Amino acid sequence: AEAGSRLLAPLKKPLIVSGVLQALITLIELAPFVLLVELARLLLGGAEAERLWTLGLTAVSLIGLGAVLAAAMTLWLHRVDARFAHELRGRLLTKLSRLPLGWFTRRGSASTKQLVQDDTLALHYLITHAIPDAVAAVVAPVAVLVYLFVADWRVALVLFIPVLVYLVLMSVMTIQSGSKIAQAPRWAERMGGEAGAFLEGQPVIRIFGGAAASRFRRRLDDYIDFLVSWQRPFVGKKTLMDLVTRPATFLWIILVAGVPLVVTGRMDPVNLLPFLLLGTTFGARLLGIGYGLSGIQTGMLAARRIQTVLDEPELVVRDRTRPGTVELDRVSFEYRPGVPVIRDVTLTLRPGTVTALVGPSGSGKSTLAALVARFHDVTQGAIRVDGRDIRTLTADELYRRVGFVLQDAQLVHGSVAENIALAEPDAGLERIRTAARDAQIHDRITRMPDGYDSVLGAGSALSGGERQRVTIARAILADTPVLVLDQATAFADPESEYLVQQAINRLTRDRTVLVIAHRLHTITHADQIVVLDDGRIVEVGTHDELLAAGGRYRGLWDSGRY
């Protein structure tokens, strides 16, 4: 795999070092068994006590050294491949912060979690155990079999029965489980998304259908059936491999092939000692890769899936590198190919000018605000903030010019201060309280038990109007030259809406504002009202001019007043 090899390129030296060290360690671990073979031969030969004690103590010390070496190598390799995993997760979190925001909506939060966390964890066997286990399985069986051939060829060839049976079982196991491992991450993402929606959309599940009439349970049954189908023959093959390559099976085969040779005048009983002592040792090492090829397949697929994300388009700042001005120019945008949501929209804000964007629902005003935010790049045209194009402004220099209030009030898990001070965490508590008072939320927060330190996670949230006021407080505290209000004060009652609108007008007397609202009675004082219909501006003007014109805005006004 090109992507798999290119992702783990830094670990070439550690992987080769681990391979060589395990080639040495398997020989060191096989060393004391040869010493015990010599000890058994001397016991049958009746050697003096000194030779027996020296061989026994050397064998004990050598097996101890082999165990210590294996533990040290696995410790070091786990440390190296925890550092690699942390670095790769950091790289992924730096990548995802630059992808076009259409990447997140079509993938979901559960898929992003599977990417950053589960896929990078799936690399564990490929980098910590794959090469040591492969080298051990190709060294220790080969060296042991070569030695046992010199000891006796008749009793060595019979050990190819369990070895060849194991090879056939391993090959058919991996061939049958190849497709299911490929299908597994898709099912993991699907199940994660279903679980996330099940927990997040709990009221909908409770009222509309309940527990039994839910999609989550249906796909849960489907996933459990898939897991059964995948894991039944898989574990069936694993246990058969364990039986084929366990020490007792090798020992029984050795004895069945040897006792006919020893009882008959065909073999000396002393030549069974190599087979009894060494011949049972390489079974457990063969099984290490038998249980590892599945881990290697998952690791390689996870490596490919991670590197695919690291090769995405990244909203790169281009090399083409008035205050308070935003200036669209023949902007056209499509969330998907062949699906135009904006059509030749030209619009220029100015300092101290409150531009009002209204129109039918689904027209394209929120996506226009997103384009101003550069969550997505305009397909055509250009958006120029202070003359500089947004595609040349870096993110720090861009979002320090433009502050936003989103339609969806998205609070993050943290204190109320941590949400009001999301943009400027260094901001003092008095600045936070001033912003909150301007947003008509400080009265609410003081009534909560902990005050501003109270957490705003799931299950400790607020009402819709209160969280929208919190987001308004965030945008006010950010204090950017340009402000965008995507449907702010939708859930606010008239009194609170009037108060926060007055606060915003006070806080943007000289700054730029782009108010977006379906409640047209608040829009009547706007400097210019831009009617966005079908993703294209159909008319521009003040309130009175638009009413006199008698077009879309007159229709919306008449529908509202009734």
Binding site: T105, G196, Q202, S214, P269, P360, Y399
Partner: protein
């Protein structure tokens, strides 16, 4: 193992008895096969090799029986693991809709997400992957030590002394790494929740310059996760060291006893040669158990999560059923007091709603007017009071009849990832296509179908994010209207809908054919157009009620509400 046995179905406990019996039998067979070498080699190496045929035959019988019992134990272990998986996951799916809303704290929601997300093969094949090898390795050296009594009592009793140190090393290895593993799991769960939050609210983080790992919450979570993981890897060295020391000390004890027996002449030289192989077999489980300590700890964590989810407190419920399946049930509040923690939300709210009318609830944000609809729908329940549907307390109603008697338009219209028709169809999935089309027509969703390329097959994203706010609101309204529930609630009517769509949907809600009791919450006078009854709630108490025109004439707080 105590936390696992309670989770097995009562159907499968016969299979659990079979599994335990076959596990003990397989371990005894393996230990017999290990110690059957000593008679075998003693007869083979002696002057009469023909006396080895009997022990070879017995070894063949024992190893064939071991293979049979091991395949059967594998089948039973797989079946038990997947049966536990299926029952636990189904119980979590069936219980969570009944769990109280207060239970879904951020940490409890994280635990519930992790427990459901633990449905993969790591937990499904738990018995075969963990319990079978762990018990086999734990009982094999004791089984060999017992079996060595037949060969020699003192040697066998010396070998069993190597199992006491094995259990001591196991307990020490678990208890030394208990803290670091718990902190590792804590940090990993925090990182999972922070990744989900980071991917879920990318807009607000990006606009706030809080996305890159040097400045973001996910970055700090990843750094803490890395620190905890490295600490855990450092802290698992004592477990490996203790297991290695225990294996070595068992080797020393076995070797000393065997040398004593051979020197005293009670043990032949070929018997000692066979005992070398038996010692190699005896020592191998010491390494196998040392491999399974992290797996055992992770399994313990996952089962604790699953049991925590299964232990959650369900809402109080009864077994009544509403008298009027189709007709409009009168909705009544009588001293309904509700509170979030120590915060009082409603204090003595009492209002009687006529059946079949259209009721309006209006007031300042933070008043409690969504909590009233939550209580009417049964999502919440009063702290001290009784919400009655047609004279019947909702707390006493069967859950099925409870959810079949109310339809709600939620303030924040969550939609599941899927086609638009799948989101509308959930209101009444058995409904005919005519009813679905009428529901979409009333809620003005026909504008979406003519606009979007795919019509009603268009795929919505995570939540309703792949549609505009007003469009997903209209899909939610269509979903609510599709249901035949006699009671219709609206937490926020047409918040994100323009004036034309708002007026059309407002007309459609009152103009639906069948009779219903309609309660609607609004922050604009156009959306309470021709409401039969009005309620004004300011601080969790209905300040005044009556007709719209009556309240306007009275000049009360409702009249000045819209003056601005």
């Amino acid at each position: 193992i105590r936390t696992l046995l309670r989770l097995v179905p009562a159907e499968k406990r016969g299979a659990v008895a079979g599994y335990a019996v076959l596990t003990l039998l397989s371990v005894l067979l393996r230990a017999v096969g290990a110690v059957l070498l000593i008679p075998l080699l003693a007869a083979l190496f002696s002057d009469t090799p023909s006396d080895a045929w009997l022990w070879l035959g017995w070894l063949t019988a024992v190893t064939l029986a071991g293979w049979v019992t091991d395949t059967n134990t594998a089948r039973l272990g797989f079946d038990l693991g997947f049966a536990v998986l299926s029952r636990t996951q189904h119980d979590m799916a069936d219980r969570l809709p009944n769990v109280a809303m207060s239970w879904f704290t951020p940490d409890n929601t994280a635990t519930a997400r992790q427990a459901i997300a633990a449905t993969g093969p790591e937990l499904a094949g738990l018995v075969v992957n963990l319990l079978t090898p762990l018990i086999g390795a734990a009982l094999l050296p004791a089984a060999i030590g017992v079996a060595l009594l037949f060969v020699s009592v003192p040697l066998g009793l010396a070998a069993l002394a190597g199992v006491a140190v094995l259990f001591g090393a196991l307990a020490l290895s678990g208890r030394l790494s208990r803290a670091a593993d718990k902190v590792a799991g804590e940090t990993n769960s925090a990182f999972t929740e922070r990744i989900i939050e980071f991917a879920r609210t990318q807009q607000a983080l990006r606009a706030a310059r809080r996305v890159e790992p040097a400045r973001s919450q996910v970055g700090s979570a990843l750094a803490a996760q890395h620190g905890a993981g490295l600490r855990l890897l450092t802290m698992q060295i004592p477990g490996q060291v203790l297991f290695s020391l225990a294996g070595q000390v068992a080797l020393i004890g076995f070797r000393g006893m065997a040398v004593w027996l051979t020197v005293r002449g009670q043990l032949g030289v070929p018997e000692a040669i066979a005992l070398i192989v038996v010692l190699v077999r005896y020592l191998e489980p010491f390494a196998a158990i040392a491999d399974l300590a992290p797996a055992l700890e992770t399994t313990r964590a996952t089962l604790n999560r699953i049991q925590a989810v299964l232990d959650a407190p369900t809402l109080p419920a009864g077994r009544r059923r509403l008298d009027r399946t189709g007709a409009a049930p009168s909705i009544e509040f009588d001293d309904v007091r509700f509170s979030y923690g120590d915060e009082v939300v409603l204090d003595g709210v009492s209002f009687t709603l006529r059946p079949g009318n259209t009721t309006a609830i209006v007031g300042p944000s933070g008043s409690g007017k969504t909590t009233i609809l939550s209580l009417i729908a049964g999502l919440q329940q009063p702290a001290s009071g009784r919400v009655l549907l047609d004279g019947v307390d909702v707390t006493t109603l069967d859950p099925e009849a409870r959810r079949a008697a109310v339809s709600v338009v939620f303030q924040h219209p969550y939609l599941f990832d899927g086609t638009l028709r799948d989101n509308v169809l959930v209101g009444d999935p058995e409904a005919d296509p005519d009813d679905v089309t009428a529901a979409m027509r009333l809620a003005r969703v026909d504008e979406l179908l003519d606009r979007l390329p795919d019509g009603d097959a268009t795929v919505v994203g995570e939540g309703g994010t792949a549609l505009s706010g007003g469009e997903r609101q209209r899909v939610s309204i269509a979903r609510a209207l599709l249901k035949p529930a006699p009671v219709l609630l609206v937490d926020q009517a047409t918040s994100a809908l323009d004036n034309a769509n708002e007026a059309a949907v407002v007309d459609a809600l009152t103009a639906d054919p069948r009779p219903r009791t309609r309660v609607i919450v609004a922050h604009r006078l156009a959306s309470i157009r021709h409401a039969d009854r009005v309620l004004f709630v300011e601080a969790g108490r209905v300040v005044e009620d009556g007709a719209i025109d009556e309240l306007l004439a009275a000049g009360g707080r409702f009249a000045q509400f819209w003056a601005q």
